[PDB]
Amino acid sequence: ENRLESILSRFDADWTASDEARREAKNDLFFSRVSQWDDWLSQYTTLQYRGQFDVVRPVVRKLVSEMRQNPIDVLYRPKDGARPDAADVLMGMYRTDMRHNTAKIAVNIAVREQIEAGVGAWRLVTDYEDQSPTSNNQVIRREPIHSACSHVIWDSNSKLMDKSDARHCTVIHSMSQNGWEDFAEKYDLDADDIPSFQNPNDWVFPWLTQDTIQIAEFYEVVEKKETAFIYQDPVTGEPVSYFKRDIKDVIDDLADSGFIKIAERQIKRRRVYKSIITCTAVLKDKQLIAGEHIPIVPVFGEWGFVEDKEVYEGVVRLTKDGQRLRNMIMSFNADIVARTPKKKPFFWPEQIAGFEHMYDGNDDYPYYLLNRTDENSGDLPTQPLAYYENPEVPQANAYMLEAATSAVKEVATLGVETYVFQDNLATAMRRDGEIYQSIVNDIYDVPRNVTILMAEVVDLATGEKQVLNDIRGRYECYTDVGPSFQSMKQQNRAEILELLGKTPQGTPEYQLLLLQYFTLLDGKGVEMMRDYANKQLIQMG
């Protein structure tokens, strides 16, 4: 019956279910990022030589560069039967609020963690920007989630790679004291009460631990049928519909401005709620956030289910054993090289008694001299001189080092190429586009394009707050994956260049060349060229 108890029961079940994969992914991250001697026991013991001769890191670097050289971003395309230009506004908004450094950095972090551990993630949030807003005095931005394998916990009853069917998810925020104070200021919490939650690292690698403060955010998605109001637009139309939850403080304002309530329907939709929690009590209970989907986008590498258990893998889990064996063999061989008596002769003391200074190493003598006789044994016994054997690296050590290096080189070959990883990244980008479209529908001012121009219908309440008015005809574009472009002008330039690359040199070639000149940036010479191209196009009609 207790909300805190129910939330903690769900979180504990999900944590315990994902315990194995989280531990393996954290082990892979530590192996590939901090050190390749992950024991923590042989540090309080006697000290021996431990070398790190890395052979997995170049593979990871090459894969990171290869998968990064081909950036991937959302591309909205009109549906079937919709207007040909139904995705222009949404695409412009996406390129406006996803061109910043934060989005690229979050995607790069997620890709690197997907390569190394097997799972990464990022987050989509909405903030109030008063200087350069995208629309409706708000902006949508993308933020990173570091160590996603341990920091983001999805619903255990999820059988999809993008976790689109997950009903709840908990994100563990770790922050310094100043970070917690800033968070409390931002979310109107009490800064004296330090929050208390489960440690994401789960008390592994105590030699690698930091003084951090943990809090949790619980996102839950609730699908229900809710009342929607049907109005008649003052400027023609009829199917203009709105949700009663959004139109709740402007119900009279709609009628006063000229909207007459026609009918009322019950329409099923999803609502996303966020809760800020500790391990003891709930700080913010069910703060409704914009969107139809949980705002966390996951990326996976080699992902599957073994026995109702989720397993994700990268490129390091298999090579760990061979790399460790190679490190151990090299350390053993360095001990053989270092701590071993050198090649020197074996002498009886009476063999060189009196001639010791000849054997110290100087070159002042033409030869060496030895004693011959003893006063009791008559003569010194004759025996071939022996020399301490030279240090040798054992055939077992050499053979096993070769075999371990070959095994790591053989098993650290992603694909043949990173096509599967890039396809998973494209899937994550498709989910990101879905989430972004829902959030835009929920907070932004999306104009309706009529064929009779873009019409924007909004109204202001008595408290001066403005409520957006978005019709139910909102999902007119679907999500695909295309090259990452910083702006719509750049996208148009790329499309024009692609068309010109295949158009034979006739009249369409001239048309596309003039269009490319039209869509150019402005200095002085390019300004003159664009003016000439505009005039030529206008004259040609």
Binding site: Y44, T46, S196, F197, W203, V204, C279, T280
Partner: protein, 421 residues
Amino acid sequence: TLAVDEIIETISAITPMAQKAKKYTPPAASMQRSSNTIWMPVEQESPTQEGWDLTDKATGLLELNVAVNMGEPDNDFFQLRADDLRDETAYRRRIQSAARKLANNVELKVANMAAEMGSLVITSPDAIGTNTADAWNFVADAEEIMFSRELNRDMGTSYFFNPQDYKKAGYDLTKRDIFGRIPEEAYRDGTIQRQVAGFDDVLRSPKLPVLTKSTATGITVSGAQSFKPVAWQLDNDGNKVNVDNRFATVTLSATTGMKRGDKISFAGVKFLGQMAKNVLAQDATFSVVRVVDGTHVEITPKPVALDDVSLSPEQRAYANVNTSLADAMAVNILNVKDARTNVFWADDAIRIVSQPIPANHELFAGMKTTSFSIPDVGLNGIFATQGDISTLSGLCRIALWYGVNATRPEAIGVGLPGQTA
């Protein structure tokens, strides 16, 4: 033979009093210099005079205060031999069990402090299963005494049963030979009700203490004594040292058989209606806090008599007892037989003062320290690991600093069934 990573869970403990106790974290920089003690004021009561001419009858102002402090850290020092297979197999779960044990210890200290400082005592000469609805009678007696004493209950009240008495209450509800909604709830689930007889939270606590009987008898007050409410007093050097209002040392004939937590009541002293100063019909009950010397005890509700002549009017405005001790009144011990205690209080009477252990400072270099989050109870401590090369081992220590304080002992209460013989 090695195990198979399928832990058999055997323990599931709950910490209701600990989770319902308010937690306070005063500024550490000031507390370190103030020696882990902070003074808080108490609600001010004003006198009142009737008449027209009031020359030379102008009273002063008197504001009392209490002090809250802390004890000693609760640690989980354990060592980790390097040359043993268990080193990584068991230390993580040892950490988890340490967290659970620390939470349990916090709860135990809260319960013991409440049961040993609870001034209000409700005694029944028979068990909870004797008559019908006597469990409701037991709860309603606490409600009525807290209502008649005019104690503030804005934050809320609470009544914690021990499991045996909770089961007796449920049994009494289920044997009603009728089934409405409460009897069916008590039949299906073991609960009686979430709210009973005016309390807004009636819980069952599995670790309430058992108040062992006192063998003390034939104890009488030695000499007439009067206790005056003051906030500060002069020391030898002339500095004004503050005075805690929740303590009074009395001199008896002999403190043989007394112990921390005994409930007593002198003969002839009756309660007062705090605000109205109207004499009640219930004997003033006190709880001994510490047996100092051999002829002195220290009781927590200071017995400020209303008829005391040596009191200034402002001091008399804080009276809570209708008369003073008279060198002959006998003190009756209310707990005469062993019985587990049911503990009720006002929600603002018990607090948990906490301080951090700043072991993350650069002074502790060579030892790795992080924050430890105790579950259930809302507390944070430190978790530190260091490595010793003399023993080839790694020391681990989970430290946690706190102190349980009873700001209003007159608000906490204790219920004792079967106080016969």
